[PDB]
Design an enzyme around this catalytic site. Structure first.
Site, PDB file in Angstrom:
ATOM      1  N   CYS D  97       0.835  -1.185   0.000  1.00  0.00           N
ATOM      2  CA  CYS D  97       0.000   0.000   0.000  1.00  0.00           C
ATOM      3  C   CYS D  97       0.881   1.252   0.000  1.00  0.00           C
ATOM      4  O   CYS D  97       1.620   1.511   0.949  1.00  0.00           O
ATOM      5  CB  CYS D  97      -0.988  -0.007   1.159  1.00  0.00           C
ATOM      6  SG  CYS D  97      -1.867   1.576   1.289  1.00  0.00           S
ATOM      7  N   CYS D 101      -3.629   7.113  -2.572  1.00  0.00           N
ATOM      8  CA  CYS D 101      -4.903   7.021  -3.283  1.00  0.00           C
ATOM      9  C   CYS D 101      -6.026   7.625  -2.448  1.00  0.00           C
ATOM     10  O   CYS D 101      -6.975   8.155  -2.987  1.00  0.00           O
ATOM     11  CB  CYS D 101      -5.329   5.573  -3.544  1.00  0.00           C
ATOM     12  SG  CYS D 101      -4.079   4.726  -4.519  1.00  0.00           S
ATOM     13  N   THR D 188      -4.563   5.295   6.802  1.00  0.00           N
ATOM     14  CA  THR D 188      -3.480   4.919   5.917  1.00  0.00           C
ATOM     15  C   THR D 188      -2.524   6.094   5.730  1.00  0.00           C
ATOM     16  O   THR D 188      -2.936   7.146   5.255  1.00  0.00           O
ATOM     17  CB  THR D 188      -4.053   4.421   4.583  1.00  0.00           C
ATOM     18  OG1 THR D 188      -4.736   3.191   4.798  1.00  0.00           O
ATOM     19  CG2 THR D 188      -2.956   4.182   3.568  1.00  0.00           C
ATOM     20  N   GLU D 254      -0.813   2.202   9.197  1.00  0.00           N
ATOM     21  CA  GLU D 254      -2.108   2.666   9.709  1.00  0.00           C
ATOM     22  C   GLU D 254      -1.988   3.042  11.186  1.00  0.00           C
ATOM     23  O   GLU D 254      -1.370   2.324  11.984  1.00  0.00           O
ATOM     24  CB  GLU D 254      -3.257   1.652   9.597  1.00  0.00           C
ATOM     25  CG  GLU D 254      -3.857   1.456   8.199  1.00  0.00           C
ATOM     26  CD  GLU D 254      -3.048   0.817   7.069  1.00  0.00           C
ATOM     27  OE1 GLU D 254      -2.400  -0.187   7.400  1.00  0.00           O
ATOM     28  OE2 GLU D 254      -3.143   1.214   5.853  1.00  0.00           O
ATOM     29  N   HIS D 289     -13.066   5.132  -4.491  1.00  0.00           N
ATOM     30  CA  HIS D 289     -12.069   4.336  -3.800  1.00  0.00           C
ATOM     31  C   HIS D 289     -12.296   2.830  -4.030  1.00  0.00           C
ATOM     32  O   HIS D 289     -11.332   2.078  -4.170  1.00  0.00           O
ATOM     33  CB  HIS D 289     -11.971   4.720  -2.333  1.00  0.00           C
ATOM     34  CG  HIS D 289     -10.704   4.234  -1.736  1.00  0.00           C
ATOM     35  ND1 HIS D 289      -9.467   4.699  -2.097  1.00  0.00           N
ATOM     36  CD2 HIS D 289     -10.474   3.294  -0.830  1.00  0.00           C
ATOM     37  CE1 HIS D 289      -8.529   4.024  -1.400  1.00  0.00           C
ATOM     38  NE2 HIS D 289      -9.132   3.134  -0.632  1.00  0.00           N
ATOM     39  N   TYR D 293      -8.952  -0.015  -5.968  1.00  0.00           N
ATOM     40  CA  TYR D 293      -8.495  -1.392  -5.704  1.00  0.00           C
ATOM     41  C   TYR D 293      -7.889  -2.116  -6.905  1.00  0.00           C
ATOM     42  O   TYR D 293      -7.305  -3.186  -6.727  1.00  0.00           O
ATOM     43  CB  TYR D 293      -9.531  -2.271  -4.984  1.00  0.00           C
ATOM     44  CG  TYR D 293      -9.687  -1.723  -3.587  1.00  0.00           C
ATOM     45  CD1 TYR D 293      -8.846  -2.147  -2.557  1.00  0.00           C
ATOM     46  CD2 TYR D 293     -10.664  -0.798  -3.281  1.00  0.00           C
ATOM     47  CE1 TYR D 293      -8.903  -1.599  -1.290  1.00  0.00           C
ATOM     48  CE2 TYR D 293     -10.692  -0.191  -2.038  1.00  0.00           C
ATOM     49  CZ  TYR D 293      -9.772  -0.546  -1.073  1.00  0.00           C
ATOM     50  OH  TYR D 293      -9.733   0.033   0.126  1.00  0.00           O
ATOM     51  N   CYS D 295      -5.157  -1.147  -7.572  1.00  0.00           N
ATOM     52  CA  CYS D 295      -3.825  -1.234  -6.987  1.00  0.00           C
ATOM     53  C   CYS D 295      -3.490  -2.678  -6.603  1.00  0.00           C
ATOM     54  O   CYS D 295      -2.360  -3.152  -6.783  1.00  0.00           O
ATOM     55  CB  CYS D 295      -3.671  -0.298  -5.803  1.00  0.00           C
ATOM     56  SG  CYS D 295      -4.669  -0.761  -4.377  1.00  0.00           S
ATOM     57  N   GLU D 443      -7.147  -5.330   4.072  1.00  0.00           N
ATOM     58  CA  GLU D 443      -7.582  -4.065   3.516  1.00  0.00           C
ATOM     59  C   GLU D 443      -8.417  -4.283   2.245  1.00  0.00           C
ATOM     60  O   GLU D 443      -9.380  -3.559   1.990  1.00  0.00           O
ATOM     61  CB  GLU D 443      -6.423  -3.117   3.242  1.00  0.00           C
ATOM     62  CG  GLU D 443      -6.911  -1.667   3.229  1.00  0.00           C
ATOM     63  CD  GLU D 443      -7.200  -1.051   1.899  1.00  0.00           C
ATOM     64  OE1 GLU D 443      -6.646  -1.612   0.930  1.00  0.00           O
ATOM     65  OE2 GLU D 443      -7.864   0.003   1.854  1.00  0.00           O
TER      66      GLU D 443
END
Ligand code: SF4
Ligand code: SF4
Ligand code: SF4
Ligand code: SF4
Ligand SMILES: [Fe+3]
Ligand SMILES: [Fe+3]
Ligand SMILES: [Fe+3]
Ligand SMILES: [Fe+3]
Ligand code: NA
Ligand code: NA
Ligand code: NA
Ligand code: NA
Ligand code: NA
Ligand code: NA
Ligand code: NA
Ligand code: NA
Lengths: 500, 502, 500, 501
Positions: D97, D101, D188, D254, D289, D293, D295, D443
């Site tokens: 991560c 984003c 995050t 986090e 969002h 994902y 990602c 996540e």
């Protein structure tokens, strides 16, 4: 004789095994915080036989004694089912791998296999093995089952490896026994065991005769080095505080066992060069062990329990989707259970007198275990929420500044103790990502063989020629029907009646 | 007494049941080509008992007779297991629904339930029921199990329906018996049966007392009308030629049974107003029946065999992906089998003496049944290829112009008879889309209750509170532990160490 | 020119194709009740273009005319997306296979392939092909795509078969054209078409040169015989009454096309012996067609609607588990849609000027289509209940005695017309077991290739060496990094920017 | 202006954020070995923009500057697609991560939402927001998106909680701004950010007006305390040696953000009591969002590569079952990618001018993300074998006695360096059980909402009445057809024939 868990723990002290962990010799494993949880799990196998004698102990026809069920040679299908019942109970009680099933399954498979070697060869491996069983039953010991070698190039057999030691082999012999070199990888509870039984891991050809060795060694044999395996979240056990461990009291243990010209006296050699029986031993060992994964249904019960608890603490225990997910977890978990106990219930007597569970149904149990724990874990994580992976440390919860902030802000429903909510989240983390996930997930995947191994064994027994003829009959095909040439044992068991 | 399948077929002749099919009265079902395959399936349940006596017949302690296992009240866990062994064998032999399981499960469930009604009420339903069992055992009859009513508005119970007849009810009584009206839908083999046992289908409240009726009626009772159900590809049976049928000899049968003031004498009434026992009867019937779905594993064996055959005929039997798919089919199929036989093996004695299989494990068997046949069928169609749905008719295959073209062009590997390739493709079509898919797929889905019914019964028995306490123990949570308030029977069975009364 | 659906149906009358169905030549397919539903589906492709011109017609640069989108050679990624939008709409409107996609995908794939043959060989196939396109655009015709031969022994190629005719081949040549013999199996809408394009179905070697033939034939060509394929529940169409059909108006059509020395003039030959381009044509045809399975998402929409309708009629529309199943159906259906349109959106220009959709994403669309319709079907059956397979016939519903009983006893919630409940159940039966299941299920499975074919293509494009290097980088592995030797096109498309 | 990843790292030094980790204040997060991998991941978002300008930077019509794409307000469907292309590349490059984003999606959603608040209420939240965008674009900063509160009793809304602070709220106002108290959980990259945008997490009723607050705060704002979250295998980062970490260079971050009377001046307030717009903000933020994902498909590419590498090292790369599992992993991964990029491709212009991706297809992307990473991980563990969980430590490998034994016994095929086999196994462990599994698995499960949240949003848009009428038409049912009463927007987008009006 060892009687209690406390007696067992004592028996592990002062042995001076050579154990490497984090580049240091471990002088006393019983006192090492990373190792002690695994020992506690084994200790519970002794304690259960004290609290629940009918479940966890058996009358041995071999010694005429009451023995721990992990050392009992199954005398009936009922004895096989009792193994499963005991395994689920122990999984409920510990939430981890309690280690002693491997040796049980090894001993049961050796009982029948040694008998058959001797019938062919006129050897006395079975007599040797029975004297060993008497000893370990009388003394009430823990037995490791050491089959899997490191294996090197997976595409080559033992005699084709560039380094012959990549599977365990006989390197020399004398008037008093054999000497073995090699290694055994991924060995459950080995440092917590009193004896380890080395067994070949693969079908062997005539070229591989030097690797056709079975023998029992004491855990403190000369020439053995243990190199401990890491686990996800392993070092939390070494940190002060027990919350972040999730399951602080119990865990599993794996190590690499290195063998350098380790001596085995003749009385502890149960196979010596009879390469054509390696496959029988592996087949029978894996037959038992593939339905010992009933143990994972006790773990499943704990994980379901944890999911239901966090849902409660979060104030949404009775919402439809969560109830549905808990049902799904239960269904998957019981599907595994059913396959394992069905296998055990369907067991049959072998020539030596031991019962062997149904091989086909064992493959089905194990194959489902390679799948469903992963789903049960995923659904647990859904129900838990994000805090299952973002929770601050216990050191922060205990801190004078951070601690009150956590106590205020990590509230669930009114009246729930935040520490309890933290503890349950850590248990979930432990079973799905951390130390106990090693067993629940990855050992479910690989224990007694990777998924493909089960598929190959289903293929061998699935009677596709018989089935083709069923279909041809119904389709009115009569002119090209062929007699099946395949193992036909499974449907003989499925349709067994008093008339055969 | 009926001995053979031939004797059974003769016992169905000349009965003049009122049967509507395609808007016509069926005068002789035995001679109707759409119905005869279902008859043949039931006949095989008699023939198997002659060929394989230990599998398909039992020694009854009730009558002291050797009886067909479908009429046997299970006296042991072994007896439950033998029901499953028989079921899988008949599935292999017929590839269809052979119908007689429903009555066997109904009788087994009634044996324990009637005993318990009498224990509370001082009635003699159990005595009546045993005399019925003796009769049907002596005569070797086929018994239907008629539970499911049409039900109307699914959100409402019997006494809340706009039309009270949408669940079967008592409409009058006299000194000699009761009169019932209503209907029973989806009834397996009812036209092929000698007697039909009517049973309530849902928990009943006090307001539903009139619907608390169990009674046995002869299939030829006055006031009964049967309206036959269609099936996918039903009418292929009525066409000349047997190839396009896939499985020409065997099939299943469903009908809607209408009841208009049908009389049931007291001696055939096994429940009369004791509404609080309706849920017990449904629970126990479904407990048995949810693991009778071992029958579908025999059908699975046939389908697997058909897929392996077409792969062979196509010239690709040993290609990796096909072998892997046949392994998958086998694994899913055996998963169902394991659940069912585990349920039976884990059976326990009821107060009446009958053994009941493990309810939790029955739910698991059936819940898997609602899923896996659909996947086995999908994989079979993958292995078969497109011709499974595009194959020309047998009339074209036999045609002087088209037929030689088909024999040339629908070749598989050399040496394979094109007619055999056609036949095996039709078998696959029959089991995945056609007449036998009704049973293999949709009855797997709905038989003994839709999927949600299993989920609710798992929920009832899944001991969440017990499990919460397991987790709390391991997490080191000690200050909010609550005693579970839930059914705890499943773990009592799971951890039972010996077979004892004390 | 054909304009309306009615025009199209008239165009099919009086052609005297030789069509065997149930051992008889069909006199007039347009009037045969088993065939007419398929014709109605194709007629809807014309009627949609009149009602929704922007959706179902395109401006052709080739003719300078507005053309039906099924005849349009895609000039942009937008044109590929519009194909998909039109496909889903037509699926919603007909609930079946409307047949005309195959020819669209064939023509698009031939446009680029012919250009490349000529670039190498100096031939005129592209020029011939464009004259053909001009003609069928102007006349507004229906084009079949006839690739799949019967194939004989699946383990052998064309030149290895025991009967050379098991794949279609050139058997002679004239000054005026070629003569072909063979067959094409499973041919969608062929009897309902004006022209059929024959194409090879597999990679060809030099030994297979005679099988390297692409040519367009009129549906009424001499030497052709059609043998109609059965469907599940086919003959319900031939029975009086429309209820039991489920979808009485629309259905699909397959037949086996037998070719006996059929003549193809040079101007309709688009490949003649250039065996090395067979693979290119198959790849590009399947690239398009694998994401034309967006059409099945329109069927999904109908089946979802039917499930929700029967829940309503049963009195349980808003119960949680039914709502959840409807959501699942929707999710799976949209997953297919997304893969298809993503493929189309990601299309790229070929040398000939036509756009080709993203081949990797097309594989993913198709592969999901082999799976999810079966699940959507299963869930629809759950929601519907047992009557979906035990419902009495319409003839019983219309009977003077049985009919009233059915009206009474097959009631759902108050106010629901029993005939509507019967109708919706029959639609579900039709789409999951009966005639439209042929398309929804089995054609989803096998159309443009069985599941394994997509797996092989994914394997060819999945850039495993590139990914190995990604992982080696992050693991700190530096000393054994190998340059990938594999197709690298997919990630060039994934990461395409204005800078390349 | 921050240009390079190096510049970014320097910007984080010397800030004196109050950060608790393991019961101590962290003096300098940039130099803490547990924290630095997350920083390195964010630094790569800057470095990519230098290496691959067209992919990772954009021409802003707001400032007229070339800006990092994470700070760009999407002006076209192409801009949405480019976000996804950039996301997948970053996932390939970091395997973790990379954090940035969330701010991007927050800013895109706020652009349209502020405009609509002002349209109704006559406020200037949109003008304020645009000045903020100008600032962060010019300075090239990292923005946190702080939506999720701790939430207390999940069955109760803000005004019903036993402690009103369990959702973030305004506790006071004055002439210069507002003061907020509460917390934001699971945040995050927050310690790695320059600014954090606080946003409500739930539909709000009138009784919840005090919780209708959006505002930007600097990461070093007074009254903020950060409490770092643990991760599976977190402390391996703090051990000497890099092998056992698996991915030593990169990770995620986090923390719990505690707010105690934190001041927000008016110019950084983008919502102040307009409770009826909370739902809109949440919907649009989650819309974006849920398809960010993509990602995770870059992470999937790494994991596939790791599985293929271990098969090679083991001597069985071309065995059919392994090849088939690799194919399965690829297929599942691509299914996620396709849904995400379809959502983006199908984006539409909002009133404020920003493009919003297709909400329905976002739900599908995310919902598949909640499932498939778990299967990809399972298959990777199958291919790896048992050593993925039983491998000895690097300290054992480097030991003078144990080390040679491991070099001998953990051989794979001839020619494979045992250290490389160890490393690839650790990478697989890291992604499936360890620190990077937090992101890849959990996540995937909960980011932008748990699975049930997607199901409810699909339900809202799935046009059941429309579909019922399709089925009625084909069944020949004519006499009970009802007009649908439901959102009808999805099929409007699906069947849109041109880009018009
Ligand atoms: S993994 Fe489970 S079955 Fe295997 S030894 Fe451990 S506790 Fe027993
Ligand atoms: S469906 Fe199967 S279990 Fe049910 S009655 Fe028929 S054969 Fe027996
Ligand atoms: S199955 Fe679908 S994609 Fe194929 S031709 Fe028919 S309508 Fe078109
Ligand atoms: S989890 Fe993935 S999508 Fe979410 S912020 Fe991190 S890199 Fe971006
Ligand atoms: Fe194991
Ligand atoms: Fe049934
Ligand atoms: Fe197709
Ligand atoms: Fe996220
Ligand atoms: Na400790
Ligand atoms: Na600790
Ligand atoms: Na017939
Ligand atoms: Na027939
Ligand atoms: Na008709
Ligand atoms: Na009809
Ligand atoms: Na470090
Ligand atoms: Na480290």
């Amino acid at each position: 004789t060892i009687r209690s868990g406390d007696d067992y723990i004592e028996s592990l002290r002062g042995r001076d095994l050579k154990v490497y962990l984090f580049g240091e010799l471990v002088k006393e494993p019983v006192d090492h915080p990373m190792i002690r949880p695994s020992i506690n799990a084994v200790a519970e196998t002794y304690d259960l036989a004290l609290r629940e004698e009918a479940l966890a102990s058996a009358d041995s026809s071999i010694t005429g004694l009451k023995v721990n069920r992990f050392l009992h040679i199954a005398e009936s299908a009922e004895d096989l089912v009792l193994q499963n019942k005991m395994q689920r109970k122990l999984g409920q009680n510990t939430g981890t791998c309690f280690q002693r099933c491997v040796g049980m399954d090894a001993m049961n498979s050796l009982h029948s296999t040694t008998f058959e070697i001797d019938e062919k060869h006129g050897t006395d491996y079975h007599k040797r093995f029975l004297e060993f069983v008497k000893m370990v039953q009388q003394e009430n010991l823990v037995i490791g089952g050491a089959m899997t070698d490191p294996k090197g190039d997976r595409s080559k057999g033992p005699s084709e490896q560039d380094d012959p030691d990549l599977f365990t082999r006989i390197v020399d012999t004398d008037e008093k026994g054999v000497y073995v070199s090699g290694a055994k990888a991924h060995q459950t509870g080995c440092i917590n065991s009193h004896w380890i039984i080395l067994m070949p891991t693969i079908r062997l050809t005539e070229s591989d005769k030097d690797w056709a060795i079975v023998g029992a060694i004491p855990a403190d044999a000369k020439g053995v080095t243990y190199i401990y395996g890491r686990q996800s979240c392993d070092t939390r056990s070494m940190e002060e505080g027990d919350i972040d461990d999730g399951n602080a009291k119990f865990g599993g243990q794996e190590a690499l066992i290195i063998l350098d010209r380790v001596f085995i006296p003749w009385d502890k050699v149960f196979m010596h060069g009879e390469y054509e029986f390696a496959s029988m031993l592996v087949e029978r060992f894996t037959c038992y062990h593939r339905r010992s994964y009933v143990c994972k249904t006790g773990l499943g019960d704990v994980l379901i329990g944890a999911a239901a608890t966090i849902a409660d603490y979060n104030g949404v225990p009775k919402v439809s989707h969560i109830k549905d997910k808990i049902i799904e977890m239960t269904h998957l978990n019981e599907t595994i259970f059913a396959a394992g106990i069905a296998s055990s219930h369907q067991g049959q007597k072998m020539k030596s007198g031991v019962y062997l569970n149904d091989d086909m149904l064992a493959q089905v149990c194990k194959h489902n275990v390679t799948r469903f724990p992963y789903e049960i874990s995923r659904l647990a994580q859904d129900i838990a929420g994000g805090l299952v992976v973002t929770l601050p440390s216990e050191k922060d919860f205990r801190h004078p500044e951070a601690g009150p902030l956590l106590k205020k802000y990590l509230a669930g429903r009114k009246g729930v103790d935040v520490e309890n909510r933290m503890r349950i989240l850590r248990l979930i983390e432990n079973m799905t990502l951390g130390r106990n996930a090693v067993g629940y997930l990855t050992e479910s995947m690989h224990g007694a063989g990777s998924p493909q191994a089960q598929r190959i064994q289903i293929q061998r027994q699935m009677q596709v020629g018989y089935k083709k003829n069923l279909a041809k009959n119904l389709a009115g095909i009569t002119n090209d029907v062929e007699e099946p040439k395949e193992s036909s044992e499974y449907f003989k068991r499925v349709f067994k009646t008093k008339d055969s």
